[PDB]
Write a protein that binds this ligand. Structure first.
Ligand SMILES: O=C1N(Cc2ccc(CO)cc2)[C@H](Cc2ccccc2)[C@H](O)[C@@H](O)[C@@H](Cc2ccccc2)N1Cc1ccc(CO)cc1
Lengths: 99, 99
């Protein structure tokens, strides 16, 4: 689809079989999700935002459906008010910005 | 243009006669710019992201030229580590997400 920005660009995602709401965010590099259980090992990762840096958990090759499109890639787990789908997965489902 | 997301969508802007680099971010509500002077009245505001909250000055009716596209609206000024062009001005320039 085409998504205007008068409202937050919120979509449904499916992960570990659960439907969740998420934000499409072109300012973030790697997807970040609220605490949940994910399979396999994780690795530490530093992410910087508006207030500074934080430590989160990095999981690789996680399967996720975004607005009905299939993606597999890195998901970070850490403290956020909402799930953030970032450039890493937005590129996999062919999203681009247009103006 | 059409902006792919293989890399940070960085664009050149002009604000208060100054040229700057800024990030186009569909995930933010309000535009945030690194400390600078702007004319007019302003009110205090707190904004919060990954890493915490920061104090900003909120200026209204500020004009910004974004990659050659003029736009007007609210600009938050404060110690952000990156300039962020948010939905309040992305809508004005007609930007959409497409996939
Ligand atoms: O920290 C924010 N990151 C940081 C960030 C960086 C890296 C990752 C994963 O790689 C994820 C998130 C982005 C903007 C930004 C880019 C570069 C440097 C600093 C900031 C994001 O793109 C924006 O959506 C919100 C995401 C956010 C939303 C709420 C709570 C936590 C996370 N922010 C915070 C923000 C809040 C208000 C406004 C003004 O409305 C602007 C920014």
């Amino acid at each position: 689809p085409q998504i205007t920005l008068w409202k937050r660009p919120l979509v449904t995602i499916k992960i570990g079989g659960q439907l969740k709401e998420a934000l499409l965010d072109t300012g973030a590099d790697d997807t970040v999700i609220e605490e949940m259980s994910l399979p396999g090992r994780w690795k530490p990762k530093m992410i910087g935002g508006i207030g500074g840096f934080i430590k989160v958990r990095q999981y690789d090759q996680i399967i996720i459906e975004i607005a009905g499109h299939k993606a597999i890639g890195t998901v970070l787990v850490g403290p956020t008010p909402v799930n953030i789908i970032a450039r890493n997965l937005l590129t996999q489902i062919g999203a681009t910005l247009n103006f």
